[PDB]
């Protein structure tokens, strides 16, 4: 009965040279029982990408909530929301439920359309912003991801090289966690093109 580790799952994000990458596993389970191998944890609102780990009902609820909010934002502002602004929106919304929180570990990723700067950020369940130059990790195998990222990562990687690094970080971390894995998805994000790749990983 620990909300953050009932369903399982992981998200990781990295920066590169004029690009960002965000990746997640596909597992959704009920403790030991694997239920779904199609449960994606990365969503997007315009060019801003959001990955969410933790309790799956909240993952879904928050996605629907931020879609709701970003749609109204766009109608009033007459422009797409930027990663820095969206990060603040996520923090505000989570802290609104300070004493009854969503059991999640969200991760924002994207490129600012005006400045062209790569941006990533992470949060705790009550909305504390964790900004980073290099990488953000989240989920039941966060320890594993911290260890993989800290050793494998290097700055200014090209999109094609960055893909290999983030993928190897996720895969090997997922293989040491019982509640993570069952497939994986990687998003490579450049200024005006986005590639989405499904990874082949061991299915146990």
């Amino acid at each position: 009965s620990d909300p953050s580790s009932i369903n399982g799952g992981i998200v990781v994000a990295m920066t590169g040279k004029d690009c960002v990458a965000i990746a997640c596993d596909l597992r959704l389970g009920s403790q030991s029982l694997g239920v779904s191998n199609k449960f994606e944890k990365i969503f997007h609102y315009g060019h801003v990408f959001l990955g969410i780990t933790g309790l799956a009902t909240d993952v879904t609820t928050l996605n629907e909530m931020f879609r709701y909010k970003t749609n109204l934002y766009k109608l009033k502002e007459e422009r797409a929301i930027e990663p820095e602004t969206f990060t603040q929106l996520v923090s505000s919304s989570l802290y609104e439920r300070r004493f009854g929180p969503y059991f999640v570990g969200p991760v924002v990723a994207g490129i600012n359309s005006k400045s062209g700067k790569p941006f990533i950020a992470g949060f705790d369940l009550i909305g504390c912003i964790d900004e980073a130059k290099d990488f953000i990790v989240s989920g039941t195998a966060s320890d594993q991801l911290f260890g993989m990222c800290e050793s494998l990562y290097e700055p200014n990687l090209e999109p094609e090289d960055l893909f290999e690094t983030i993928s190897q970080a996720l895969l090997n971390a997922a293989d040491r966690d019982a509640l993570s894995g069952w497939g994986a998805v990687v998003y490579i994000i450049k200024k005006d093109e986005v590639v989405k790749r499904y990874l082949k990983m061991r299915q146990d």
């Binding site: 594993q144 260890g147 494998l152 293989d175």
Partner: peptide, 15 residues
Amino acid sequence: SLIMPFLDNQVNFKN
């Protein structure tokens, strides 16, 4: 938990 998956990758060439 930090070191072991890195070893799987770099010593035993996993994934």
